Amino acid sequence: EGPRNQDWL
Amino acid sequence: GPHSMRYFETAVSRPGLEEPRYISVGYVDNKEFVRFDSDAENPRYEPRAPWMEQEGPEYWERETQKAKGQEQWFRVSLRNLLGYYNQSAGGSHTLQQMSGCDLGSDWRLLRGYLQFAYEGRDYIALNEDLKTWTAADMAAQITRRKWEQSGAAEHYKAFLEGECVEWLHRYLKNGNATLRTDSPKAHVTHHPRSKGEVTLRCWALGFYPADITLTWQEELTQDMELVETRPAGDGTFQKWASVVVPLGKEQNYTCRVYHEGLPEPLTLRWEP
């Protein structure tokens, strides 16, 4: 499965 | 072998406003297996390698959501980027992520990878320690402040150690051979050159995977000139290695070929 990102750039 | 999983996430905006395009591709063992793209009428994750077709709708459901969440995440983080670098809108901008992990022969996790490029240049990357960020340039530091503050490095460190490894195990189960190789097919061609000279081009055809070493001689590669490995179009690959020789002096040269799918190293010389 894919990674889920957290805090934005 | 050195088994790996990677997801290549891309966000593009072009002039003409509106919303960035979000492509996301996934690879097991360097072979594309899943794919998402916002351009489509019905933007789903689709299977890319027949062994993925053994996955229930609910898998495709859940990853289509997950991806629709990155389309989101990317839309924003691009807007901040235009901010930081103080750029004038209505131009093309690119944002890229490489995420994924490396597996030992014992299905040991060796290394994890999480990186980002902006305008095709490295922006920020998790170090191998999996605790600190390498950030090239000032705008990348801004981001590094936030992410140390928000424990973002723990959040991914969890994905790479836990769920990456886990789903890699399974994708490998699904792909049993589906490790298949194709041996390379090699001939040696003769194309004469001006002033009592000739060229020795050594072609290797039909092979898979692309890993290939072409060696002709003994043991000199100095004057020789070779080409970028290239897909055939059918699954297989090509490349060639040439060298300049004096006319009629040809016989002493042997072209050596090294591929994983071979019984042993193959060598051949021009036969007119």
Partner: protein, 97 residues
């Protein structure tokens, strides 16, 4: 980064005998590109085109192809247009390469 083009054929080329022409473009950025293929300076209506994909050096590559048949005399070129270049670049198919 300016792209890298190679025009080549799937199978060893034979005159009169059908084959496929690959124009292979790599190492560019931004991903948005353009590719024409050409028979005698003229446009081939229906070129097949590889989905957007980029390498671990961050740069992109597309692979374009159409069916063709080599002859002694017809010309076969691939034309590439991309932001990193002043004017469109063109590379002709050479059976020896």
């Amino acid at each position: 980064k300016t792209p890298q083009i190679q025009v080549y054929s799937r199978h060893p080329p034979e005159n009169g005998k059908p084959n496929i022409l690959n124009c292979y473009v790599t190492q560019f950025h931004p991903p948005h590109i353009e590719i024409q293929m050409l028979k005698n300076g003229k446009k081939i209506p229906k070129v097949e085109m590889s989905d957007m994909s980029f390498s671990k050096d961050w740069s992109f590559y597309i692979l374009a192809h159409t069916e063709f048949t080599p002859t002694e005399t017809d010309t076969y070129a691939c034309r590439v247009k991309h932001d990193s270049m002043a004017e469109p670049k063109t590379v002709y198919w050479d059976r020896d390469m």
